[PDB]
């Protein structure tokens, strides 16, 4: 504590969080970026926004935050506030309506070698195209593009920590199953600025919907109405209740439309399979 | 020694972010404005709100932050927090939720020659009076009005940005490769205009703003499949009542009044979607 107090006072006596933490301005700050998916909160088909709970692990070296443990009682690692130090400004480029950057400023683990590890939490509300063609049997490949907003690849380089996101602490989802996940790095250089590449890391998740809820709540009543539709042709005309049966099946389907709109998403990107079945049943009646 | 630190101390040791970068009070600061739209999230008919994801391209000159790359080891760009530099304070005047400023205060890029670039991203919820007459086969004219919350036209003025070809970007910029069209709305046009008013002697100090008019077209597929076609068929069913016999077992009044009941159910359904 006294050793760490003295060390922190020495470190932040003339520290600057404005400039990049490099010995020479011609050096590059390498940032190892690792995304951990903790939870898949929601998939919004109407607004095309996937909400996730993530830990965005970031690792980089700070040249000025170095010390010898022998001069400070053997202190080899410490925790300091992240707001006091320079950090990369990773931004979710496909942010729909959430936060673009990190807002929860947790503490960084600082090694005596200058190595920083910062693992803040974030709620990523990301915008991805939601193909509803095969709904509720639909598969959705949704990506999260991450990159340094104000720094280019020539001054700050970013690399993935691993080829795949960390799903070790992922909570089981009751609506989606993550079939595949992969983190790809991309570099784009423009002819106007040939010496300043712009880098990003895009994590994509291929997810398959679990359709039992919609099968039980939507498909089975529609099947029952479809079966009941043809029974009027076995009902004799002398009963005087043919129109009663047919029009009341129509009334039941019309009331069930309220449940249909309540349950399924409402979007005009395409006609869902469940919507096609609803329209088929209605034309049938 | 990092040369970035030396440049930062040279520029910012004697610098006031509260003062405009003008040598005289009556000089005007010119702001080059570009607005890039990333995603059109939603248009809430009930609240009459348009939610969009944008980032604003802001460029201007600051003679106080002017440096030569030769003197400072060849540095052509410097990233500093936006709170340390003067800003024109561009706000969305027609926001409906009370959020005027940008979502993330990104760093400003200070280039050599006094050129300052700021590219902050923003989420805006703007007023859009929904023209309900032809709903759902309707198009809207949502506006995004940008202005300086502090400075008048004589103090700060706006100009449109120019691309590498040199033409003026008098519209909303959209990156085609990165743009995913909204599921319900298609953006057709997006002109931009710089307006000036209150500039008369009787009016007093002049005022200016930039207005972007998003012309958006609704895709009526959901309403066509789910509401209009079933309602049309059910409303056509009453014509079948003319062919049923006028006897006890005809069920003529059965078919007619139950079609009315289904129409009432559709009224309840439609009341949840239409504007108020």
């Amino acid at each position, epitope marked *: 504590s006294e050793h760490e107090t003295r060390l922190v006072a020495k470190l932040f006596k003339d520290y600057s969080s404005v400039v990049r933490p490099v010995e020479d301005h011609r050096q590059v700050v390498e940032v190892t970026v690792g995304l951990q998916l903790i939870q898949l909160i929601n998939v919004d088909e109407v607004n095309q926004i996937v909400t996730t709970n993530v830990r965005l692990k970031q690792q980089w070296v700070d040249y000025n935050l170095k010390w010898n443990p022998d001069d400070y009682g053997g202190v080899k690692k410490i925790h300091i506030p992240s707001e006091k130090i320079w950090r990369p400004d990773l931004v979710l480029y496909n942010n729909a309506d959430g936060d673009f950057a990190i807002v929860k400023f947790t503490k960084v683990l600082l090694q005596y070698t*200058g190595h920083i590890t910062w693992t803040p939490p974030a709620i990523f509300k990301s915008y991805c195209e939601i193909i509803v063609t095969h709904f509720p049997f639909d598969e959705q490949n949704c990506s999260m593009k991450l990159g340094t907003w104000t720094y280019d690849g020539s001054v700050v380089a970013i690399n993935p920590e691993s080829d795949q996101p960390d799903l070790s602490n992922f909570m089981e989802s009751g609506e989606w199953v993550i079939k595949e996940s992969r983190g790809w790095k991309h570099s784009v250089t423009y002819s106007c600025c040939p010496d300043t590449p712009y880098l990003d890391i895009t994590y994509h998740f291929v997810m398959q919907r679990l359709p039992l809820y919609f099968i039980v709540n939507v498909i089975i009543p529609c099947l029952l109405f479809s079966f009941l539709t043809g029974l009027v042709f076995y009902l004799p005309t002398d009963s005087g209740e043919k129109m009663t049966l047919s029009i009341s099946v129509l009334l039941s389907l019309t009331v069930f439309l309220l449940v249909i709109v309540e349950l399924i998403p409402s979007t005009s990107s395409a006609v869902p399979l469940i919507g096609k079945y609803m329209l088929f049943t209605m034309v049938f009646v | 020694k990092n040369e970035e630190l030396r440049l930062y101390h040279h520029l910012f040791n004697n610098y006031d972010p509260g003062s405009r970068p003008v040598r005289e009070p009556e000089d005007t600061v010119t702001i080059s404005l570009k607005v890039t739209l990333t995603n059109l999230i939603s248009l809430n008919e009930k609240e009459e709100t348009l939610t969009t994801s944008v980032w604003i391209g802001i460029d201007w000159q600051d003679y106080r932050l002017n440096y030569s790359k030769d003197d400072f080891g060849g540095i052509e760009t410097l990233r500093v927090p936006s709170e340390l530099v003067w800003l024109p304070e561009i706000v969305l005047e027609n926001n409906i939720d009370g959020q005027f400023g940008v979502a993330y205060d990104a760093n400003v890029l200070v280039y050599e020659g006094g050129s300052v670039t700021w590219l902050p991203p923003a989420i805006y919820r703007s007023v859009c009076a929904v023209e309900v007459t032809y709903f759902p086969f309707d198009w809207q004219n949502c506006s995004l009005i940008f202005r300086s919350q502090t400075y008048n036209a004589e103090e700060v003025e706006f100009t449109f940005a120019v691309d590498n070809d040199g033409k003026t970007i008098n519209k909303i910029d959209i990156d085609t490769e990165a743009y995913t069209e909204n599921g319900e709305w298609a953006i057709d046009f997006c002109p931009g205009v710089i307006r000036r008013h209150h500039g008369g002697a009787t009016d007093g100090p002049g005022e200016t703003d930039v207005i972007y008019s998003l012309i958006i077209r609704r895709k009526p597929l959901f309403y066509v499949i789910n509401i209009i076609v079933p309602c049309v068929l059910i409303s056509g069913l009453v014509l079948l009542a003319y062919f049923l016999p006028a006897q006890a077992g005809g069920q003529k009044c059965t078919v007619s009044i139950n079609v009315l009941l289904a129409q009432t159910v559709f009224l309840f359904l439609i009341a949840q979607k239409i504007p108020e």
Partner: antibody, heavy 122, light 113 residues
Framework: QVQLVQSGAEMKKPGSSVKVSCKAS????????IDWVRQAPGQGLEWMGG????????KYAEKFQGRLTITADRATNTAYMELSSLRFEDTAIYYC???????????????WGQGTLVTVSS | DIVMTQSPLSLPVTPGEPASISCRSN???????????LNWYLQRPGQSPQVLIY???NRAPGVPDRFSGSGSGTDFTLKISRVEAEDVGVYYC?????????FGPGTKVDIKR
């Protein structure tokens, strides 16, 4: 103090492959800032290859293309080289030169390994 | 490849008086941003090489203040304020601009007697 420790000396024959490591301690190193330099007996230094952020991939000399593979592991703070199809003239002391923070389009080599003698002889 | 040469091939020195080494390239090493990519390396007898000056003017961390460097687009110089007994070895100049990077033939140094 930052120290680079290379693998041990190796005795090889023509046509075989030698893999030399370069392990770092006392500091943190990344995916870039690695260069391998050999010194034959009674001859000067010669650059073999390395990794720079400009290319994001290793670049080798014309002599070593197809035979040399250079890699750097950020997680374990070590780098490797793998030279295949060894010849008699490849006998030399092989060094690793590294920088904690790499330069974009060049290299400096502030920290050097102790050098490993690879002797190719039948 | 860019050809790099140094002079003198062998320089006797006495401790307590300055010294100078020179290196020359067959192409201008000037970068577009305005700095010259030329590094100097010292290999003491039996030890690994040590960087002395990088980019032709910058003293590396941990290097004594004696070693200084300067140069132009094609000609570069390395100077020692006052030679010490520990400064004996082979000095190499290296360009870091164009792949393949090339070291010089190397300049030898020894105590004069």
């Amino acid at each position: 103090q930052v120290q680079l420790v290379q693998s041990g000396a190796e005795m090889k024959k023509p046509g075989s492959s030698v893999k030399v490591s370069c392990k770092a301690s006392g500091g943190s190193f990344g995916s870039y800032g690695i260069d391998w330099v050999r010194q034959a007996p009674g001859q000067g230094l010669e650059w073999m290859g390395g990794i720079m952020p400009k290319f994001d991939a290793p670049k080798y000399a014309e002599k070593f293309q197809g035979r040399l593979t250079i890699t750097a592991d950020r997680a374990t703070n070590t780098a490797y080289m793998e030279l295949s199809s060894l010849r008699f003239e490849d006998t030399a002391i092989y060094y690793c030169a590294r920088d904690e923070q790499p330069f974009y389009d060049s290299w400096r080599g502030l920290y050097w390994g102790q050098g490993t003698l690879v002797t190719v002889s039948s | 490849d860019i050809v790099m040469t140094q002079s003198p091939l062998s320089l006797p020195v006495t401790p307590g008086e300055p010294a100078s080494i020179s290196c020359r390239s067959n192409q201008s090493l000037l970068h577009t941003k305005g700095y010259k990519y030329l590094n100097w390396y010292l290999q003491r007898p039996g030890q690994s090489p040590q960087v002395l000056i990088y980019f032709a003017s910058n003293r590396a961390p941990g290097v004594p203040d004696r070693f200084s460097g300067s140069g132009s687009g094609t000609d570069f110089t390395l100077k020692i304020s006052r030679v010490e007994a520990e400064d004996v070895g082979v000095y190499y100049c290296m360009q870091g601009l164009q792949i393949p990077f090339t070291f010089g033939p190397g300049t030898k140094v020894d105590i004069k007697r």
